[model samples]
Target: KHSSDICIVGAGISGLTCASHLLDSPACRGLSLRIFDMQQEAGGRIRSKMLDGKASIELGAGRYSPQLHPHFQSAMQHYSQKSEVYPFTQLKFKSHVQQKLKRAMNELSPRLKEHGKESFLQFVSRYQGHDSAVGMIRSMGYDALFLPDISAEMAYDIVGKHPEIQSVTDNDANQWFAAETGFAGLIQGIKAKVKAAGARFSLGYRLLSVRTDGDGYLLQLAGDDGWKLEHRTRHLILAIPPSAMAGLNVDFPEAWSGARYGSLPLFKGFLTYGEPWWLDYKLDDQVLIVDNPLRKIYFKGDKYLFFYTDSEMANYWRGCVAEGEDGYLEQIRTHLASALGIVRERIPQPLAHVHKYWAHGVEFCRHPSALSHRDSGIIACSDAYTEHCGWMEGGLLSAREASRLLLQRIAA
Candidate 1:
């Protein structure tokens, strides 16, 4: 039976931020803190994989912008020795068969801007009529619910029947966006701040269970041998994926927990690579996307990043036999070839590629009604609670809020 002043689960940005905030406060001084993460590394989904010579690509949760992100900026200034973080916002939006569709759409209706507010399928239907729109929407996975903020990179993700707009209606679509902080740098900076705060991190330790007592929660960690690590504190904070929340079987009020942890709808997926193909092509600042089948490509420094939704073709492209080092490169090859007519041979083969998978399809972006915590002293936070996801700013924002709640408890 081990005990500490407080115990935190999941060492993602939110968890680390809460820990840093707690320790810095005078009320929490002298309190012992312990952080646990299932992954071997501290950054949860916000992780970076080092590739060949002079190249490191983020496998998940990449990209941030200072213009829109405050917490991420503050953390970077506090933690990283590297300074002068600049904006890398040259971005482009395209789709799978852009040229042919553009030509056809232009011939049918010159100004497509009027259709921008409508669902892509609805726009096609209004211009081309129902049958054509249905066929196109079916091929593109048309969802009737359209948001003005949808990215051309993620546009083609609608290859299946679109989920009812009712799903995202809960969230204000105008609120989603990206910040200018080079994605990888934001994560590295956050990690630096946590380490500087005298916090200890245990990575790759799988969480088997969480036990709650009168004083605090005991996180059962799985290592060589399963053991209960008791963390005794006045408050506890959690920054884990919602999917993991369900897995831990945290006891919450039925209605509140059910609504929060019930299910995750499909949105889009994210990918990154070490080869600077866009840079080689001199397309560094723009995000390239294939609208149909919704394949998105972007350049981060020397790395090539791609994203797709969960669809049959996307799955096939994802599972295609990799002729080269990384299995997914072949799919990227075919995607670029069929969509951009980029000569397959001319495209430089990447020395390395990394894929990060998320079950929620997209990052969680909803703030569930917190179940009154009459018993278990568990608190949760994620980018989902804030306005943005797939970026560092939202992660930090959520952490800040949760930290405030913890500070109050400590003071009490």
Candidate 2:
């Protein structure tokens, strides 16, 4: 049996941030803190993979704009000397359907306020009123914005709340930023800082259940060796997604347990060529929006390029490449060729290729009331519980809020 003054479930961005803040708090100075995660590594949704031990390919939660998320900006600044931050250019759409999409968006803007409650598909169907407009909008860029199963209200609020989205008339105004060391480095730096301050991390521990023990909580965790470990803590911070919480056998508050959380399916494909062949066509450092199965393409430095698909299109492509299916790579190459206005033969052979699929890639704040639990000694902190939903800013902000609440309750 293990015990701590405070136990954090899920060592993601939120959990790590909460631990770091608590360690710095005078009230929590001598309190024992322990963080647990199912994954072997930390960072959760923010993942980075190395290509051939040279280039870094982000598998999840890639970029953030400081202008839109000040909290994230401040966090990055704290580790500026150890991290490399750069401004990412705005994504440009090079589709043949660009003009049509612009026209459709202009015409559809006024109707958004009225049909905000409708599904994205339904809203587009009612406002677009034409097959071409629908195709153009879906295939152009809005498809990336409004993932499958997302309501228009959530999508609108996601983009509308951010300054970059509201002022996207100029490509420069839509600028974003990224870490050259990737978000993984930032996570590592924070982990080191928190560890130095005496935060304990328990990796590869799957939380199975949570139950109240008098005034505290008892947590049951399963380890790789099929052994169960028990932990007792006075305060528990659940920095995990709603889907994760649903799997646990716990008597959580009805408001949170019954709250509906929406997720988007995302698939990413990375191809590393021996050389940057796309540069020959003057496509260096460009982002291409395609009206095909492969929706977004960004040319990363060196010989790396990535393709992203979300929503129904992600599922459609997944089905096309499932077991017993044929021509998976060929189909992807063909689509890429077409998107770049090139022949299949002209496409360069990739030295290596990898893909990842995230079933719940993002969380949307559809239920605000469920963000907090009415029960004492248990707090839920995650991006889904914050206004910035789907961004590191939300996780950081939510962590700060959780830390404050936990400290206040513990002192009381």
Candidate 3:
């Protein structure tokens, strides 16, 4: 029986940014907003675990480079209570895989071109026979990246623009950082601001269906407590990911675009020790590419270290830890021993540990499209619909476009 001038689904950075912008804009000042999320708490994927140090452990949406993520960087600077910037990676212990990739990309960049809608893997196999080419993909720090649904342009934009790979291609905008309070701070700050701006929120309210209702739309949302509510809005904004949208039993992307949208699995595992053991080997603020289950490993400050894996390796770590943590720790030790060329018995057990897995950690389309999509009374915005889909940068960038579209449409 309730109505809102504006309604937004999903409360991640995209939703928060949208809400913030809507309230800030003079055109949308008087709009009564209602926000709903399936999760009880906000922050969405920007989850962080507190550590003894000022900087927390990011189980989700971890680090960013100020150069690449200007929007997120500015927001972080504005809201974050403390600043703890550090070099993203160090090359103290050099990687042959890194060198091999450097040479391969230079050789392949001129040749790896696609005429039609072709996959990166297909494009590479046709021209370069692909022994070292595939090695370059893994060396770039991701597995199964060249998916059947992914295009060459889509794949290249991802790898070619990465700080590490781009450095090899003579693009040196590579300094990255993580805050003392973590990305969660920015989320909490914006969420509080939006809530204070008369934006009401309903947690655990999952949108079931939507239908046209005159100039607006009628939304059906079911709560976990079995309580259902039928709501109406003058304007509806679905800020959830493409994966969630596709699962909503609504014909969404069909009307938005014709290109295929897909996601890749992402997992990060962190291990803490009594003291910085990796630093003994001069591995501070450094990232090592391991040709194993632990695809990429990063050594953070003096507190802890983490292993990041995506694509096939991401899936492998997902199941590897699910069965038991015993084997997981052992695999960590084994991989560390081989990757660092050290003895297995030398490495000590971690004092504490934490991990997170995201099935849609990286979502993107086969081809680029509009920053935001509008369908009559409904407008959908997602990082998956943008060029920077995988990172928090994409979420913030996508939000900017979505807010502009919503305000413009409403003002019209």
Candidate 4:
């Protein structure tokens, strides 16, 4: 029989952070803790894979802006220098495109403030007209915000709540950081600390169902062998995505399924090459924002480039995954050539490539105000539940909030 004072479902960053904090809480000194995850490893979306057994390439969440994310910044201060945090350099656009964008933003600034709850695309179409100049301006904002399907009001609301979003939207000169070792390093650091604090991890255990059992809760988990095991705990913290919660076959609040709490599809494609050929075109920008299949491209070092896609574009790449690597590479090369306005012959073939797809990549802009269920001994925590929805800071902040609530209940 498996039992604990507290059970955290999902070993993602939020779950790990909450577990670590709870272990450190003096109010819950003797409480037993158990963490469960379906994956064989921890880290959740902050995934990294070694390339050629030397270079580490991030397949998931790669960068976190310290100036914007206080919780995440505080956590990083605890780790050693092995995580190699450095500021991301200023991004550049093509000369002609840059001039056009400046003009467009200058014209649209005042009008944008008056934008209503209409979709961003609709808002631009109504005010700026759907020309290449408007598309270029929209692409720049879309690359960072990743809210193509979201309305202007909802997007603005998110920005109002999070200063980081506001900084990006306004094109204000701000600092962004990336960890050379990748975000996985940060996750591993926390996981090690949590383990040291006496939290037991049950990896590869998928949550089958959850139910209330007398004064506690009964959780049915399915292991790799397909056998169901029962676990009882005084409290339950669901540090997982809303979609995962929906699958657990348990009664949950309507807010969990409401429109605002919906998830957005996201995709990332990483390519490593013998050289950074884009530099030959005098495009020294570390990042490229474009209105193509690859919406955002980040130049990581000299040999690596990262491509990002969201919403409909992400869904399109999901179909490419089934076609195998060769098919996907062809599409990527074609898209890159078109996006850069370069000939197919000029595009360099990558030495290696990796791609990841998150069906629930981020929370929709219109998230609900209530992020947890206080009365039922069930609490929801994830990036989706915090003000900084798309970043690791959100997960960390949510974890802190959940930990505080859990500790309060335990003390009582």
Candidate 5:
């Protein structure tokens, strides 16, 4: 059996960052801490694979919105030097394109009524627009996939739902855009500090049980060598995916462990990996595609192109595809051939790629749940804890909240 002041489950960004902050806090003066993770390494979903392009690109939570995610900004500030971070601006589409698309959409509205048709392409063909709108939609059918249903008003609502914007101070003066931060470097910095602070991080130790002791809890650990160990800690923090937590049954007070922890539904979205095309064009740093199924693209120069789709598209895939039902690994060749106009045979060699279905891709949390629900000691955290939905900011915000709670718990 092992004993410590605190035990954190799942060494993802939230867990790791919380441990880092706690260890550095004055409130944590006499505390010893331990972290347990199922994987061989930390950074749960924030994983990367080296593409043949000589750099590793993120497989999960690819981009950060500094305008919204303050914790991410803080993490960057704490770990990255001023020179390592670069600012990006959004590429504005010409208004003529939107106007022409609107006109074309209007032209198709009556036909849609007569034919009872819903396809975005079918509607676009009916409208007569300037070349740019037509070219943009045709070239980026992923964006065109959305024109049939989503309106401008709905898009605004989707952006407004980000919980971080509401929970924190709003800096509306700063325009929203993407930025490049050294993720690998940031992880290294935090890891070193956590270790120096005397927190024990056991990689590849899968947690089997969390049973209550006289006053605290005993955590069971199992590894590849068939070794069994027991560790005890006064307080426990969960910083992994809600879905992963849903899989484990933690013995706690019924009120502390509520239905929200187990009740949240996993939203499925496809994660595609391939060449970073934004680097190819050297276009503006960010691209916003209008009337397209693929909604937005953030160009990370050499990193990768990150895309986020609307709910309709996300739900459509959930219903049709089996693998993507939860999440799916896409064949880069097939996706590029069909969506991006590349010949399947002529597609460039991919350096590396990995895709996994996320049960908690984003903050599907609509109400105060396990993480947000206030308790005496136990606090939960994940990207699903906020409204940002599967981005770095949400994960960072979750970490921030968990850290605040830890400090408060120490004070109390």
Candidate 6:
């Protein structure tokens, strides 16, 4: 096995950002670097696919606010992609519930700062009444959002940053969002830039173990082709999620520890009709928060509609699909009809369908921006530990801080 200056594991946005930044920095000049990922592709969670070259459907990380997302909006510009206003604050459906949910959510932020540490559900119960709190969250369409363990701050971040029901944040600037060319496009640009800068990529390599070498680390890797490989580096960056970290044959943060981490599953199902029928009702780019398993459905543009669900609902949809496409379509028709206040026959059969399920669609840590590291130089950088966790914004933030930390140590 040969040696290098640095070895970055997990070639997602987090890892790519670190490599790009380090390669660009003057302090890191002349250093050899190699980035690796367990997947055959470099991008981890940022996935975008087009249906019949008509419309883009995001299977992973796809929302962004230019004015609010500090690191991400700036990157979204590099591709010369224009922003699409995704304003969903119109508050549609369940008017009686909306009125109450609106006021309850609006009253949260002021008290949130002080009670940020407490679980969201408990905090809401103390203020909004115990019985009403659960129903309020359920009516809002996001399941398990107010769980006992999710702190108020974390809860707001989830509501405030995401589209639809974002009115809970009370921040008008966050009301509209767009990812420009989408995260997949941005990652492609970064990958090209890194490759042009001389950094190498070892795709399809899964990091298995990490051990201390002379003054650095040895990495054991499993390639996609069923072969094994090993490499040594003066420094190592673990740009992976907690699930991956826990699976590795190494203790984490030998002398450092912070942040309680967990992930939420996400599932999206797209239904493409023969035409843009929702536009006839004058609804475009609108989001409907349903009490059913569909949870949140978007009218999207002139092409298709998609529903995004989390918690038990995500798994519920997965289960629906397990029964086969015909059965799944029937389930979709039922959910769609009820959500739109129409007869099941009123909802026409879709021309095509697509779906994706993410076991950990989003990961978050209780602590704000805590990166785990070994005093010996093995550092773990994850979006789960950043302010913008679960988004590419957090990945960039984590990468920026990790690269800065690495530069300081390497130069000294």
RMSD of 4: 3.4
Q: Give the whole-model CA lDDT for all candidates, comma-separated.
A: 0.52, 0.74, 0.77, 0.71, 0.55, 0.77
The numbered model that scores best in lDDT is 6
| Top candidate, metric TM-score | 6
C-alpha positional error of residue 366 in candidate 1 after TM-score superposition, expressed in Å: 5.6
The lowest-lDDT stretch of 10 consecutive residues in candidate 2 is 163-172
Q: What is the per-residue lDDT of model 1 for residues 74-117, given as tens digits with 9 covering 90 to 100?
A: 66666543443222322233233333343444454434444444
Q: Report RMSD for candidate 1.
A: 7.6
Q: Candidate 1: which stretches are off by over 4 Å?
A: 80-196, 224-234, 252-258, 261-286, 291-294, 299-318, 321-329, 342-351, 365-374
- Weakest 10 consecutive residues, lDDT, candidate 1? 160-169
Instruction: Name the lDDT value of residue 74 in candidate 2.
Output: 81
Q: How far out, in Å, is residue 116 in model 1?
A: 15
* Model 1, CA-based lDDT: 0.52
Question: What tens-digit string does per-residue lDDT give for candidate 6 at 268-315?
Answer: 888788878888776687888877878887887777888888888988
Query: If scored against the real structure, what TM-score would every candidate get?
Result: 0.68, 0.90, 0.91, 0.87, 0.64, 0.92
Error of 4 at 402 (Å): 0.9
lDDT of 5 by residue, 206-269 (tens): 7776666765777787885778988888887877676665556653324343435322112222
Point out the higher-scoring one by lDDT: 5 or 6.
6
Clashes, model 6:
0
| Residue pairs with clashing backbones, model 6 | none
TM-score of 5: 0.64
